[PDB]
Write a protein that binds this ligand. Structure first.
Ligand SMILES: NC(=O)c1ccc[n+]([C@@H]2O[C@H](COP(=O)([O-])OP(=O)(O)OC[C@H]3O[C@@H](n4cnc5c(N)ncnc54)[C@H](OP(=O)(O)O)[C@@H]3O)[C@@H](O)[C@H]2O)c1
Ligand SMILES: NC(=O)c1ccc[n+]([C@@H]2O[C@H](COP(=O)([O-])OP(=O)(O)OC[C@H]3O[C@@H](n4cnc5c(N)ncnc54)[C@H](OP(=O)(O)O)[C@@H]3O)[C@@H](O)[C@H]2O)c1
Ligand SMILES: Cc1nc(-c2ccc(OCC(C)C)c(C#N)c2)sc1C(=O)O
Ligand SMILES: Cc1nc(-c2ccc(OCC(C)C)c(C#N)c2)sc1C(=O)O
Lengths: 207, 206
């Protein structure tokens, strides 16, 4: 009885992706992942239904990942690397093109709460990555797709609670979200239209 | 002195479309060079003259520059991620045509990466940035009255007319709305104060 049942996850091998993947498999989703050839999912962990090996910078690989899905979750990032980059914005351009070509409308994509900050207050060391989040958000906003812009504060290692605050179109009352709660929220956004076209800032106080 | 007739190159682009609309609304007699006229909007403000052709074809550029008072350049090559010379070769054709027709004023957009350390440029944007640098040198060496416009990220916020312009360096904000950027390109036609300078338009929106 799953209206959304087939999903693509971009970034499933990452910090938030791994727990999003685990929670999605447990919840009954049929998950397709795009993984880079050198970086597959861990063998002991939950297995998705379909694996595409390739790169988000290749339209052909993104097309193969998006075809036949109900919705797309985007958890791309650069791990610890703070260098100038366009992997997230160019990846988003490819995702948008594939979604349009394949009739997929719902995209839930993670950038960061700095897109809700006074821009001159972003820490300089994070500005190069933030610049690409800004480029990525513009690509997704201008696409016309049903886009949920997830803009989290610091991502931590605290528990899954399902009890976090979701602040619409502004910064929320806490400065952290656990990676498990962030993935839980990305999946929650598949089951409702209420956040489409909005920015969302999930946050919580772990106690 | 008084500018009434302008050519716009890159009028079908993101900044070009709004610069064109604003220029027509303000009263300029606008000539555009477009590769495909269906990419111009069917409704609303329409340019006075449409040349169908390619900035890489000197004859097309000459036909676009003839009779103008000033030229606005909003060329770009969004998809190119490896060495590309479209913008700089286009600028060479524009310079030759302006010299041949006695047009003295050019306001051309490159990017604020030309005001930052080269290591700030994302790898996949290096080729476009290299050609922006080539285009900037072509225009600086031309002897024409040249305003170098070097914007940071181009956003979609509504026109304000209230942005800051920093001369020969960078200002505090790192966004300019495409509408404000177009407004600034047109402001550069009304004054000589920016000639021979680099200009960085930016603003705080919220
Ligand atoms: N850390 C924070 O406190 C914080 C706060 C707010 C926002 N954010 C942002 O939240 C987002 C998610 O962060 P995260 O820590 O969960 O992610 P992450 O650990 O950095 O994981 C990045 C994911 O993207 C994949 N990826 C990168 N390049 C790719 C490419 N060319 N093709 C295909 N996949 C590619 C990575 O695959 P590989 O396994 O192959 O590397 C990995 O799965 C990021 O954009 C981050 O900037 C982070
Ligand atoms: N945030 C940003 O995006 C950003 C920031 C700083 C600087 N810049 C730079 O600012 C400039 C303007 O950017 P933009 O986004 O407004 O431009 P754009 O949307 O990419 O449009 C580029 C324009 O150049 C035209 N063009 C390309 N090749 C041509 C050719 N051979 N002959 C004739 N016309 C040609 C295009 O015509 P068609 O419609 O026929 O394709 C289009 O009208 C660019 O140089 C860009 O690199 C961009
Ligand atoms: C408290 C607080 N931390 C934030 C934060 C922290 C680290 C980040 O990136 C780290 C890097 C390794 C990607 C990013 C991003 N992008 C955003 S935002 C925020 C707020 O208050 O809004
Ligand atoms: C914040 C910031 N963004 C810049 C930027 C962004 C996109 C660009 O190209 C778009 C691509 C699709 C061709 C170019 C160029 N050229 C430059 S520069 C800059 C700064 O602050 O220096």
């Amino acid at each position: 009885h799953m209206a959304v049942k087939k999903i693509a996850i971009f970034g499933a091998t990452g910090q938030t992706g791994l727990t999003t993947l685990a929670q999605a498999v447990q919840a009954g989703y049929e998950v397709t992942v795009l993984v880079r050839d050198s970086s597959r999912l861990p063998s002991e962990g939950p297995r998705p239904a379909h694996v595409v090996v390739g790169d988000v910078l290749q339209a052909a690989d993104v097309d193969k990942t998006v075809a036949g899905q109900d919705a797309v979750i985007v958890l791309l990032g650069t791990r610890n690397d703070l260098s100038p980059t366009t992997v997230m914005s160019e990846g988003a351009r490819n995702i948008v093109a594939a979604m349009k070509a394949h009739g997929v409308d719902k995209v839930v994509a993670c950038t960061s709460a700095f897109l809700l900050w006074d821009p001159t207050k972003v820490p300089p060391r994070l500005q190069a990555v933030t610049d690409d989040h800004i480029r990525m958000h513009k690509v997704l906003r201008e696409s016309g797709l049903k886009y949920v812009a997830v803009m989290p504060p610091h991502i931590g290692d605290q528990p899954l609670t399902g009890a976090y605050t979701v602040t619409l179109d502004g910064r929320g009352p806490s400065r952290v979200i656990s990676k498990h709660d962030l993935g839980h929220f990305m999946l929650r956004c598949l089951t409702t239209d209420e956040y489409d076209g909005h920015s969302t800032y999930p946050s919580h106080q772990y106690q």
